[PDB]
Structure 1
Amino acid sequence: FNVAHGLAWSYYIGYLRLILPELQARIRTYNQHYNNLLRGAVSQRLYILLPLDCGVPDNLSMADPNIRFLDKLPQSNSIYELLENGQRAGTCVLEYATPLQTLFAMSQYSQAGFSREDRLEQAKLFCRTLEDILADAPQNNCRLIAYQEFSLSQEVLHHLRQEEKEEVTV
């Protein structure tokens, strides 16, 4: 009995599969304006945060004050700026894997018998299953950032700078 299997398939089938095909076109359109205004570029991939403690807050800034909402990507998703010593070090479309909230709610529902360690195992299994799904899916369109709570903004920036290095080298 592994709820993560169905949660991952549901998340992909009913959300990621629908959002990812148009994502890059939407970001290219946004970046024509963003490059004109700020001489930079929003990253092209959807970054999905997978906190293995299943703690999804209302506002990303609550998890790290160097992660601040910047703007809405039209047609919607949220663009966040990533700060270093008060400077914009990076920009990306960032959001939590919402099925993790189901795992958290289950661990607080006493009739489930779903312990805290159960939640952790299932959150790990959720990450591995989603990676397997995305690996075969019609991409290079999104990145899973799984972490056990360290700076979350620094971990995102790690990925954003690696994405740019891949962009310009291959």
Structure 2
Amino acid sequence: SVAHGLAWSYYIGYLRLILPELQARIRTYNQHYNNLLRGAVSQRLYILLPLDCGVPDNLSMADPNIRFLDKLPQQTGDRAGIKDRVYSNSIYELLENGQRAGTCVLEYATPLQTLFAMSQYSGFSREDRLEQAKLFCRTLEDILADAPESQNNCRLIAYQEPFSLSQEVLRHLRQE
């Protein structure tokens, strides 16, 4: 049940705040900042849900075919006593054969780091961590399916390694 609460926490504390302005920020980037010949940034927030709960800080460290392109225009807002809290979301090019194949706003679901931290060493086994990660994912899918902030503007990317993270994301980008 901890992961059910973490999924709610992620929606209430982050996704409900970030999803409503996302379309407008992507449109700003596409119309004002993006070089003439660069491909458009895709319209969705792509959230990585590694079922192993491995959340590295740097996506280019995780797969060099995920290349940092630029920041979205920043979203600021008062939040829980932070005046003008800053959200500096990252845009990535997904490379195939050294060339851009897709461009998107991509990040990991941060609460998966809690499940990982509490099970990295051996109570709370790897199998228990997998079960919590799946519960997180199922709970978050149910929340977003019902949430008025989720309007074809978010895509959950849940995966288990048996692998290219870039190819996993591209399969989701190309399903749209």
User: 1:155/1:58 Cα in 2 relative to 1: closer, same or farther (>3 Å)?
Assistant: same
Deviation at 1:121, TM superposition (A): 0.5
Partner deviation per Cα, 1:68-105 (whole Å, 9 max, x = no partner): 1111001x200011000100111000000000000011
Q: Which has the higher strand share?
A: 2
User: 1:48/1:9 Cα in 2 relative to 1: closer, same or farther (>3 Å)?
Assistant: same
Contact 1:34 1:41 in 2 (8 A): no
- Runs (4+) of structure 1 moved beyond 2 Å? 33-40
User: 1:155/1:109 Cα in 2 relative to 1: closer, same or farther (>3 Å)?
Assistant: closer
Contact 1:71 1:78 in 2 (8 A): yes
User: 1:85/1:36 Cα in 2 relative to 1: closer, same or farther (>3 Å)?
Assistant: closer
Partner deviation per Cα, 1:3-46 (whole Å, 9 max, x = no partner): 11000000000000000000001101110025552252100100
- Distance in 1 (CA, whole Å) between partners of 2:155 and 2:131 is 21
Contact 1:54 1:101 in 2 (8 A): yes
- Distance in 1 (CA, whole Å) between partners of 2:43 and 2:54 is 25
1:130 and 2:140 matched: yes
User: 1:65/1:125 Cα in 2 relative to 1: closer, same or farther (>3 Å)?
Assistant: same
User: 1:85/1:126 Cα in 2 relative to 1: closer, same or farther (>3 Å)?
Assistant: same
- Distance in 2 (CA, whole Å) between partners of 1:55 and 1:85 is 26
Q: Which moved more, 1:14-23 or 1:31-40?
A: 31-40
- SS of 2:30's equivalent? helix
Partner deviation per Cα, 1:85-142 (whole Å, 9 max, x = no partner): 10011100000000000001111477xx211111010001100100000000011110
User: 1:73/1:29 Cα in 2 relative to 1: closer, same or farther (>3 Å)?
Assistant: same
User: 1:109/1:141 Cα in 2 relative to 1: closer, same or farther (>3 Å)?
Assistant: same
- Distance in 1 (CA, whole Å) between partners of 2:173 and 2:113 is 25
Task: In structure 1, list runs of 5 or more residues that go unmatched.
Answer: 163-170
Contact 1:67 1:153 in 2 (8 A): yes
Contact 2:45 2:155 in 1 (8 A): yes
Partner deviation per Cα, 1:45-79 (whole Å, 9 max, x = no partner): 000000010000011122211111111001x2000
Contact 2:49 2:109 in 1 (8 A): yes
Aligned length: 158
TM-score normalized by structure 2?
0.85
- Distance in 2 (CA, whole Å) between partners of 1:98 and 1:19 is 14
TM-score normalized by structure 1?
0.88
Please name the residue that 2:28 is paired with.
29
Q: CA RMSD in A?
A: 1.4
- Distance in 1 (CA, whole Å) between partners of 2:166 and 2:26 is 21
